[PDB]
């Protein structure tokens, strides 16, 4: 009950920066996820050179 109360207090400070910020955060998050996927794909092709 104490941990839930602290986390809910911090989230309330970011939610105050508007929908536009949330859009940016969503975009950033999407891009980081694609970079992570491409790096992961390059690593898997090198192990296969027999």
């Amino acid at each position: 009950k104490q941990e839930l109360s602290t986390s809910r207090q911090i989230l309330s400070s970011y939610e105050f920066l508007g929908p536009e910020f949330e859009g940016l955060v969503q975009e950033y998050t999407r891009l980081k996820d694609k970079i992570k996927d491409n790096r992961w794909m390059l690593q898997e092709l090198s192990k296969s050179l027999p």
């Binding site: 839930l4 986390s7 809910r8 911090i10 989230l11 970011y14 920066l17 536009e20 910020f21 940016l24 955060v25 975009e27 950033y28 998050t29 891009l31 980081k32 694609k34 970079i35 491409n38 790096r39 794909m41 390059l42 092709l45």
Partner: protein
């Protein structure tokens, strides 16, 4: 449910202008990793004769 919603916000300074810069940096990094992935794919072609259709060594 409340902690998971907080970890998505931490790499981003609460400043929109600075976030746009981080987004542009992430777009450059995505183009470089895509070129490296295409080159390694082409060298793929020549090596010749011979052995069946088949073989070990």
């Amino acid at each position: 449910a409340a902690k998971e919603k907080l970890n998505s916000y931490l790499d981003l300074a609460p400043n929109p202008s600075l976030v746009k810069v981080k987004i542009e940096e992430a777009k450059r990094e995505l183009k470089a990793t895509e070129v490296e992935l295409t080159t390694k794919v082409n060298m793929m072609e020549f090596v010749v004769p011979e052995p069946s259709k088949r073989r070990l060594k």
